[PDB]
Design a protein around this ligand. Sequence first.
Ligand SMILES: *[C@@H]1O[C@H](CO)[C@@H](O[C@@H]2O[C@H](CO)[C@@H](O[C@@H]3O[C@H](CO[C@H]4O[C@H](CO)[C@@H](O)[C@H](O)[C@@H]4O)[C@@H](O)[C@H](O[C@H]4O[C@H](CO)[C@@H](O)[C@H](O)[C@@H]4O)[C@@H]3O)[C@H](O)[C@H]2NC(C)=O)[C@H](O)[C@H]1NC(C)=O
Ligand SMILES: *[C@@H]1O[C@H](CO)[C@@H](O[C@@H]2O[C@H](CO)[C@@H](O[C@@H]3O[C@H](CO[C@H]4O[C@H](CO)[C@@H](O)[C@H](O)[C@@H]4O)[C@@H](O)[C@H](O[C@H]4O[C@H](CO)[C@@H](O)[C@H](O)[C@@H]4O)[C@@H]3O)[C@H](O)[C@H]2NC(C)=O)[C@H](O)[C@H]1NC(C)=O
Ligand SMILES: *[C@@H]1O[C@H](CO)[C@@H](O[C@@H]2O[C@H](CO)[C@@H](O[C@@H]3O[C@H](CO[C@H]4O[C@H](CO)[C@@H](O)[C@H](O)[C@@H]4O)[C@@H](O)[C@H](O[C@H]4O[C@H](CO)[C@@H](O)[C@H](O)[C@@H]4O)[C@@H]3O)[C@H](O)[C@H]2NC(C)=O)[C@H](O)[C@H]1NC(C)=O
Ligand SMILES: *[C@@H]1O[C@H](CO[C@@H]2O[C@@H](C)[C@@H](O)[C@@H](O)[C@@H]2O)[C@@H](O[C@@H]2O[C@H](CO)[C@@H](O[C@@H]3O[C@H](CO)[C@@H](O)[C@H](O)[C@@H]3O)[C@H](O)[C@H]2NC(C)=O)[C@H](O)[C@H]1NC(C)=O
Ligand SMILES: *[C@@H]1O[C@H](CO)[C@@H](O[C@@H]2O[C@H](CO)[C@@H](O[C@@H]3O[C@H](CO)[C@@H](O)[C@H](O)[C@@H]3O)[C@H](O)[C@H]2NC(C)=O)[C@H](O)[C@H]1NC(C)=O
Ligand SMILES: *[C@@H]1O[C@H](CO)[C@@H](O[C@@H]2O[C@H](CO)[C@@H](O[C@@H]3O[C@H](CO)[C@@H](O)[C@H](O)[C@@H]3O)[C@H](O)[C@H]2NC(C)=O)[C@H](O)[C@H]1NC(C)=O
Ligand SMILES: *[C@@H]1O[C@H](CO)[C@@H](O[C@@H]2O[C@H](CO)[C@@H](O[C@@H]3O[C@H](CO)[C@@H](O)[C@H](O)[C@@H]3O)[C@H](O)[C@H]2NC(C)=O)[C@H](O)[C@H]1NC(C)=O
Ligand SMILES: *[C@@H]1O[C@H](CO)[C@@H](O[C@@H]2O[C@H](CO)[C@@H](O)[C@H](O)[C@H]2NC(C)=O)[C@H](O)[C@H]1NC(C)=O
Ligand SMILES: *[C@@H]1O[C@H](CO)[C@@H](O[C@@H]2O[C@H](CO)[C@@H](O)[C@H](O)[C@H]2NC(C)=O)[C@H](O)[C@H]1NC(C)=O
Ligand SMILES: *[C@@H]1O[C@H](CO)[C@@H](O[C@@H]2O[C@H](CO)[C@@H](O)[C@H](O)[C@H]2NC(C)=O)[C@H](O)[C@H]1NC(C)=O
Ligand SMILES: *[C@@H]1O[C@H](CO)[C@@H](O[C@@H]2O[C@H](CO)[C@@H](O)[C@H](O)[C@H]2NC(C)=O)[C@H](O)[C@H]1NC(C)=O
Ligand SMILES: *[C@@H]1O[C@H](CO)[C@@H](O[C@@H]2O[C@H](CO)[C@@H](O)[C@H](O)[C@H]2NC(C)=O)[C@H](O)[C@H]1NC(C)=O
Ligand SMILES: *[C@@H]1O[C@H](CO)[C@@H](O)[C@H](O)[C@H]1NC(C)=O
Lengths: 360, 360, 360, 155, 155, 155
Amino acid sequence: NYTYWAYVPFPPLIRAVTWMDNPIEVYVNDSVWVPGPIDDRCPAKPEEEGMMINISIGYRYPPICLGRAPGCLMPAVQNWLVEVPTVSPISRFTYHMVSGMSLRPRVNYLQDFSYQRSLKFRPKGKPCPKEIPKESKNTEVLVWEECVANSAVILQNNEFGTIIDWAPRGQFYHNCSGQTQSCPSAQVSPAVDSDLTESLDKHKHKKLQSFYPWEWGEKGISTPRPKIISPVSGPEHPELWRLTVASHHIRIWSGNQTLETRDRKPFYTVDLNSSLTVPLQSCVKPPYMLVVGNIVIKPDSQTITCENCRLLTCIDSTFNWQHRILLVRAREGVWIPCSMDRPWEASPSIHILTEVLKGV
Amino acid sequence: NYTYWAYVPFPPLIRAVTWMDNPIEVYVNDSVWVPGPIDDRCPAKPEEEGMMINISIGYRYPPICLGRAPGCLMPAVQNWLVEVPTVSPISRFTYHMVSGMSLRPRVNYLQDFSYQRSLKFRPKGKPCPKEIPKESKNTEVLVWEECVANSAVILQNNEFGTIIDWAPRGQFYHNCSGQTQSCPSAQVSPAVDSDLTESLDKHKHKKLQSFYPWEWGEKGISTPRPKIISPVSGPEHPELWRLTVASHHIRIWSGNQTLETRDRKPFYTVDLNSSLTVPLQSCVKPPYMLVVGNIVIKPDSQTITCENCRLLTCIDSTFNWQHRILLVRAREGVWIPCSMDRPWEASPSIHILTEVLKGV
Amino acid sequence: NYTYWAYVPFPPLIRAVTWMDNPIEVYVNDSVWVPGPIDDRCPAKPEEEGMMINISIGYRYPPICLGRAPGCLMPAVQNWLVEVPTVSPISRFTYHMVSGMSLRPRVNYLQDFSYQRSLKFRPKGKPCPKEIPKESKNTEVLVWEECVANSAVILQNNEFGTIIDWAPRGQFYHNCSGQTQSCPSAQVSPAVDSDLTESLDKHKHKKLQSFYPWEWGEKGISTPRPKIISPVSGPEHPELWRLTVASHHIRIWSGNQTLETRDRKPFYTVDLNSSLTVPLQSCVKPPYMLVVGNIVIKPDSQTITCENCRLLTCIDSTFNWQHRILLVRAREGVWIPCSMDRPWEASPSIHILTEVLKGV
Amino acid sequence: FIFTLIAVIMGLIAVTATAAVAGVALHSSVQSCNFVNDWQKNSTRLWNSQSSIDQKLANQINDLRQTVIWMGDRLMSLEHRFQLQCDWNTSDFCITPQIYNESEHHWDMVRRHLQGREDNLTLDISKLKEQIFEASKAHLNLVPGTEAIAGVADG
Amino acid sequence: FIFTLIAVIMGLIAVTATAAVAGVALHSSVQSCNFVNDWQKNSTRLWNSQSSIDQKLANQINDLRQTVIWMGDRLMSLEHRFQLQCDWNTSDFCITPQIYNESEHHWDMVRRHLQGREDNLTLDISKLKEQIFEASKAHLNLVPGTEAIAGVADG
Amino acid sequence: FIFTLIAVIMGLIAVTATAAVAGVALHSSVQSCNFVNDWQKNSTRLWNSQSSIDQKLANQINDLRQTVIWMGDRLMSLEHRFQLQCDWNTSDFCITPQIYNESEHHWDMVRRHLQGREDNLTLDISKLKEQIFEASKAHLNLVPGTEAIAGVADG
Ligand SMILES: *[C@@H]1O[C@H](CO)[C@@H](O[C@@H]2O[C@H](CO)[C@@H](O[C@@H]3O[C@H](CO[C@H]4O[C@H](CO)[C@@H](O)[C@H](O)[C@@H]4O)[C@@H](O)[C@H](O[C@H]4O[C@H](CO)[C@@H](O)[C@H](O)[C@@H]4O)[C@@H]3O)[C@H](O)[C@H]2NC(C)=O)[C@H](O)[C@H]1NC(C)=O
Ligand SMILES: *[C@@H]1O[C@H](CO)[C@@H](O[C@@H]2O[C@H](CO)[C@@H](O[C@@H]3O[C@H](CO[C@H]4O[C@H](CO)[C@@H](O)[C@H](O)[C@@H]4O)[C@@H](O)[C@H](O[C@H]4O[C@H](CO)[C@@H](O)[C@H](O)[C@@H]4O)[C@@H]3O)[C@H](O)[C@H]2NC(C)=O)[C@H](O)[C@H]1NC(C)=O
Ligand SMILES: *[C@@H]1O[C@H](CO)[C@@H](O[C@@H]2O[C@H](CO)[C@@H](O[C@@H]3O[C@H](CO[C@H]4O[C@H](CO)[C@@H](O)[C@H](O)[C@@H]4O)[C@@H](O)[C@H](O[C@H]4O[C@H](CO)[C@@H](O)[C@H](O)[C@@H]4O)[C@@H]3O)[C@H](O)[C@H]2NC(C)=O)[C@H](O)[C@H]1NC(C)=O
Ligand SMILES: *[C@@H]1O[C@H](CO[C@@H]2O[C@@H](C)[C@@H](O)[C@@H](O)[C@@H]2O)[C@@H](O[C@@H]2O[C@H](CO)[C@@H](O[C@@H]3O[C@H](CO)[C@@H](O)[C@H](O)[C@@H]3O)[C@H](O)[C@H]2NC(C)=O)[C@H](O)[C@H]1NC(C)=O
Ligand SMILES: *[C@@H]1O[C@H](CO)[C@@H](O[C@@H]2O[C@H](CO)[C@@H](O[C@@H]3O[C@H](CO)[C@@H](O)[C@H](O)[C@@H]3O)[C@H](O)[C@H]2NC(C)=O)[C@H](O)[C@H]1NC(C)=O
Ligand SMILES: *[C@@H]1O[C@H](CO)[C@@H](O[C@@H]2O[C@H](CO)[C@@H](O[C@@H]3O[C@H](CO)[C@@H](O)[C@H](O)[C@@H]3O)[C@H](O)[C@H]2NC(C)=O)[C@H](O)[C@H]1NC(C)=O
Ligand SMILES: *[C@@H]1O[C@H](CO)[C@@H](O[C@@H]2O[C@H](CO)[C@@H](O[C@@H]3O[C@H](CO)[C@@H](O)[C@H](O)[C@@H]3O)[C@H](O)[C@H]2NC(C)=O)[C@H](O)[C@H]1NC(C)=O
Ligand SMILES: *[C@@H]1O[C@H](CO)[C@@H](O[C@@H]2O[C@H](CO)[C@@H](O)[C@H](O)[C@H]2NC(C)=O)[C@H](O)[C@H]1NC(C)=O
Ligand SMILES: *[C@@H]1O[C@H](CO)[C@@H](O[C@@H]2O[C@H](CO)[C@@H](O)[C@H](O)[C@H]2NC(C)=O)[C@H](O)[C@H]1NC(C)=O
Ligand SMILES: *[C@@H]1O[C@H](CO)[C@@H](O[C@@H]2O[C@H](CO)[C@@H](O)[C@H](O)[C@H]2NC(C)=O)[C@H](O)[C@H]1NC(C)=O
Ligand SMILES: *[C@@H]1O[C@H](CO)[C@@H](O[C@@H]2O[C@H](CO)[C@@H](O)[C@H](O)[C@H]2NC(C)=O)[C@H](O)[C@H]1NC(C)=O
Ligand SMILES: *[C@@H]1O[C@H](CO)[C@@H](O[C@@H]2O[C@H](CO)[C@@H](O)[C@H](O)[C@H]2NC(C)=O)[C@H](O)[C@H]1NC(C)=O
Ligand SMILES: *[C@@H]1O[C@H](CO)[C@@H](O)[C@H](O)[C@H]1NC(C)=O
């Protein structure tokens, strides 16, 4: 036998997409509610979605994974609220709200379950607004604008790396400045995970009542832009939220804040109602794919293993979050030794003369 | 005969540039009055400009054509006005104006010949100013800034597609809010097509008189950025106005708005005068070319035909708008079957042995 | 002999980087004090730095050179000052200042050694601030923002070309408007070249006293962005300052402006002190290199010659400004005639038959 | 991706205008490979003789989308060309060993492809490339056939 | 750099999932070149049969960094491929005349390279390429050796 | 377009500095092809041995203009190389069959081209490529001439 080195420029292998990569394109099929890029077509080969595969690969930089496991970012519901001032002695604002699946911040268990925050590596950009504009036209159409928050939330702070996000997160709260300790200093989330899955066809209502006015913050219709800062420094990835939002329906709310006199003192109430949901689809294009299943990441040996897992292109509202998502790409050329039964040859010219002599 | 498939990587064919393409570069030869990119050289082969050709091609997306015919955008004069506040009891403003060949909006024949407007697909960008700045330095140099108008004008709404432009258009008008119906609601264009062609060397004057003050809008020294929205969605093309503006001279005006008492009530007058014009040249570079002639577009079969038409690179003020302009590019490789008199061969090794035996 | 034309795709030659090139990347190893891009690694081949070479090349556009010679930009110290208003009857501001090696403007010898200035080719961008902000949090971290000054400084106005820079330069001065001729109208530089080299480990103090309040201008933490305007027009090069700043330590200052009554009239004093310096390293990456030595540029014949000069990749604080820096890049393919002892051949097929007949 | 060619024999306009007469016959029926060679000869010469990118024009580009997309098509075309097997006697363009059937590909599909159409009556390039890739392997075409080896091995 | 392939026989998902069974054997020991040929056969066919860039998706790209970095890797790979010397009987992929030593490169280095690792126990690609470049020159490999010329020149 | 090479035998600085001694003779007169081969040998080895783009540096790039202009030149150069005809015995660089006239191209034109000049006394590369393209066609050079076929066919 003769074994030689061989170069295969297009191997049928895949590589994991890492946090040191630059952002990739994720296409959604609904321009009304989600910014671009937009594509409403089905996958080019719909019969191939969901094929099973066994995976055992390594990496150099931490892979990008979504789900509930070590090394993957957990999903949760995020709320974006538009506030319109009202000239009336009994009402303060009229509300429009959008709820969707997004990236979950970590929680401070010392405080009242507040988000873990960081001030490291503040980027350049337009600051998030602190005041409601005096006028807002075309409330039905939602305008998404990139925004920089007063502080960054922490998405991961363990041996798999440190991920932070400078996009704002919105919640209901009370000022509690210039007041006594009776003022509650806890934040309230008007929507939870159940509002996106359970009883889609029915009418949903939410009510908040307190003796103090309700404020919303941080403001800004802006989506997460996470990045890694330890042990390596990488660029922002504003496309990851697009994959999570298509895993569930998005819910559209409307409502108001009103005021009435209770116990000889002002009483403030927030009402929100919804009977409308929108289904979405989010896809990546070749040479990018998705690996879905029980992804296991081992940070000590830098190995990714997943047994009996599926290969997909698109995420829709039938996704089960028992599984996890790993972003992959078709790999570059590789070098491999292979064995032949004859020595290496450059041309068949000697070979041709063999049958010429036989033909004489 | 033996007929085989052949690949030609550099065929001498051309492809039409469509509205789904990204913007291309157009070079002007005058930096003082027109923004970049700038190139003042003549075409590399001046002796080849104007060669005649017969064209019969197809397309997939609507082609970009300029002129007066179905499927092409009509040109018209646009006016950009710089206005400076004046502290005087008899004058309101001093004026600087530029008039150039541009893209013509459609006209509402129901109203007083107002422009057809649309609110669809509002882009992101700096809003167009609504108030005159209190001070303006260096009025002699004109600063062009991209701008988003309150509404988009419509350039085409037929079976060839829907083209809209979110850049502002400026006209003279009267504020009729809080007034009677005696105030005219019409809008006046201070310059027309004739001011760019007829009597270039003569002095041009324009006078407007009314009992109501004259306002200019929309403001902003901004050029058209048209795009297609139906039946396909494509990017903006801010370079198309550069080709039209070179087909005529541009005219520079100056003037003022003054006030005097007539019939015991204020009387407002606008004076503009001009004795200066600037000739320009606009060019595209290879692999892009221009097809000029009687271009015919058939939307049912998606065919472009043009008999006895010229191939050009540059547009100057000697252009005749009896003809139309089609943007084209050199085509990519093509596949063609051709016939040989012998079977396909990989090497001449067998051929070489033929004369070796003959040479023995 | 037979001499044929040959093409060498990767010759071991170099080309000079000119002002018509687009900006290249320069990596610094300190994210705290200098913006990105950041790389703290040593050169890949540290044993090759400083190899000697003789150079004799031509050019088409003026080369980019730094140092003290015809055709090269001279370095000098630039100061960036942060001002924080203080509410106190005896003090005006608290100060933070950074001093580093930068590009030197030309000097008007007619005036009180003021900078030569130009108003040509004003770029688009955010104007430089004219007023001190009332809210400046996190003064310890310095935020660098691109800025457009009221006027451009001139860096070169000779037969080698005209280089101008629209970035601001800051100095101490008095208003001297509404005052008498006794008001000094000269600008003062709080730091000089000696403050970066002499007595690094010692304490540095600077004091300014006058009967008129001290103002700083132009404001803005913005680095030079020079460009060529004559006889050719090229893009800005905001990376050249990164190479100069690493040739010396950068000095960090702090201080205040205070007020006291002297001779029954207000007396204003500026105090600055420093006991901290930071060393830096700046590098370029292959295929870019640096040529360091006695670089000579001849504009009449467009030749660059340098005898016994070193090749480098990184600049640090041990650099001697007796030498100069020329930016170079590995060259593209070239055409060269070479001679063979036999005629040109396409295949060895005839050669192979020669030993076949001999082997019979 | 942008060049200024002053000293070339023919410009892009002359190459396109002069080849149009012969392009009429190419659109109507199958021609000989010599006919195709004369038609594309000056176009291939023009695109093999540009020297360097015009730096004066290149450094003024603001939006890179159209340039990058153009470069991606050129890179893909070069990759496919490196894999093709071509007849030895023609070097301006590649002639593959794939025989034209004319029962799978009626001439109207070829004419529509030459005109720049991509409708459902046009020749499918992706399907055609798959056939050529499988039929052009070296172990099937590099060694001359029996009828050629026997003909030359007469003694 | 982005294509929509509708009429191809196999998509990227099927190509990746079907080859995974044979990839287990490739990760364990040295296989024959025929075995490697079958493993990569459908992947090479897919990447030689795309027609044109999907313009609908390409014109919507906002950040070009990831696209440009991908194109740079492809351009570098094509440059190195143009310089390699390959066995005549295999055209899908290049077999170099460099003999595998197995004393310098233990199989564990090869397995780590196939898995996508770049640690200090992985095969050094840059060092391997330098060895192959110096050992594959035309004046050392194009002319068949004496044992081959003598064997065929028996009369 | 940006790499970090740690384990290569020679860096870019050493390749440039070591070859400068021989470059003096190349600037003065015509040398043999063996001389040119030795002069460029280590430079060609360096540019065939880089492994992958340094991702730590590449993802920090803000302005892509210089990188795209560099890639466009490399793509154009690769396209022209794929069309050239080269002598079989030299594979590091391409030797064309175009005979050097020395009456059309005085040596001073060649020296100015090697120095990187583009004035009116410099060799015109575009005109030279057109001349080489027309003279290097396969039907004119692949078949050896009569004096070579007759010499080997002595019996
Ligand atoms: C972007 O891409 C996503 C991909 O998911 C599309 O989402 C799909 O949207 C369609 C249209 O809205 C949805 O279809 C609708 O589903 C409902 C019925 O199915 C439910 O109920 C039955 C039993 O009744 C169950 O078997 C089933 O599992 C579902 O729970 C109804 O809301 C709709 O019915 C309407 O149409 C049918 C047929 O025409 C009529 O009979 C009805 O009277 C009624 O009019 C409808 O069928 C679909 O479920 C979504 N797919 C999901 C969520 O995975 C987006 O539409 C697409 N967006 C754009 C803009 O292209
Ligand atoms: C960008 O590129 C455009 C290309 O169109 C250039 O435009 C040309 O500019 C030149 C210079 O301004 C113009 O030439 C001028 O034309 C006029 C004379 O020609 C007219 O009149 C005669 C009879 O008098 C007719 O025969 C002829 O057909 C024309 O109708 C005059 O305005 C000028 O004359 C001046 O120069 C001549 C010669 O030096 C003197 O004799 C005169 O006394 C006088 O000084 C001049 O010749 C030319 O017409 C333009 N071309 C057009 C419009 O197509 C731009 O200049 C260029 N810009 C930059 C910045 O490079
Ligand atoms: C970016 O890259 C630059 C590359 O220049 C790095 O700069 C180097 O930084 C180090 C660490 O600060 C400097 O080393 C320090 O130098 C001083 C001593 O050297 C001087 O004095 C001796 C004699 O006393 C002379 O021989 C010598 O020439 C110098 O004049 C001291 O400040 C420091 O000493 C400290 O460490 C030593 C050893 O650990 C202890 O003995 C001391 O007690 C003390 O703790 C130190 O050695 C080095 O000089 C810099 N190089 C230069 C200026 O060229 C940057 O650090 C790097 N930045 C980052 C963020 O990576
Ligand atoms: C080597 O090159 C020489 C010179 O080439 C000429 O000068 C260069 C500097 C460039 O400008 C070239 O483009 C230019 O051709 C060639 O000699 C030339 O040969 C031609 C063809 O035989 C001669 O043309 C003829 O000359 C006379 C007088 O006009 C008449 O017989 C004909 O009408 C015809 O024009 C030409 O004069 C001659 N030039 C010189 C300067 O001697 C030479 O052929 C070439 N060697 C080759 C190709 O092997
Ligand atoms: C491709 O380019 C070549 C030139 O490189 C073109 O060949 C040229 O064709 C013209 C027109 O037929 C020839 O002109 C002829 O000259 C004389 C009179 O001077 C006479 O024979 C004819 O009346 C005619 O005018 C020209 O000589 C010839 N040039 C050559 C052969 O070098 C060719 O036509 C081009 N082909 C295409 C398809 O573009
Ligand atoms: C690469 O793609 C080819 C097809 O282009 C694959 O070959 C195909 O393999 C399948 C599975 O073995 C064959 O199906 C077989 O068909 C019959 C019943 O119809 C029977 O023999 C088996 O039960 C099996 O189902 C299919 O015919 C065959 N297609 C061919 C030869 O054209 C090949 O497996 C792929 N290889 C890789 C590594 O991806
Ligand atoms: C291209 O690179 C090669 C190496 O890959 C260079 O060859 C090397 O040249 C040096 C200097 O002549 C040789 O050193 C010699 O070593 C011994 C003593 O140790 C003695 O023969 C001499 O005194 C000399 O110092 C070195 O061995 C040699 N390396 C080899 C042959 O592998 C070559 O010079 C480079 N050429 C260019 C143009 O850059
Ligand atoms: C929340 O409830 C309000 C109030 O009922 C809904 O708004 C009304 O919707 C009905 C049904 O289309 C309309 O006829 C009314 O004109 C709407 N306005 C009012 C003041 O009654 C609203 O649609 C609900 N929001 C959501 C998201 O379902
Ligand atoms: C474009 O096509 C027209 C129409 O066929 C050509 O004009 C005819 O040319 C023929 C051939 O010389 C003449 O016999 C006719 O008299 C011409 N005129 C007609 C039919 O009206 C024309 O030459 C073609 N143009 C180009 C540039 O090739
Ligand atoms: C046109 O008229 C409108 C309506 O009066 C002007 O807007 C008003 O501007 C005055 C300025 O004193 C304000 O007091 C009003 O509150 C404005 N009204 C509204 C509804 O906004 C507008 O400025 C005028 N435009 C021009 C160009 O003169
Ligand atoms: C419009 O007319 C004004 C007023 O005549 C012109 O401005 C004068 O131009 C002359 C001729 O150069 C100068 O001497 C005067 O100083 C200018 N000012 C005044 C107040 O008279 C103006 O140039 C004309 N505008 C155009 C565009 O031709
Ligand atoms: C300039 O001098 C001030 C005043 O001494 C320094 O600030 C003090 O630094 C010391 C030493 O760390 C601290 O203990 C003090 O708290 C600081 N403040 C005061 C008010 O004393 C300052 O560090 C010096 N600046 C530089 C750049 O060296
Ligand atoms: C082969 O093609 C030629 C033209 O190239 C034609 O003249 C000849 O008739 C053909 N032979 C046939 C059809 O047998």
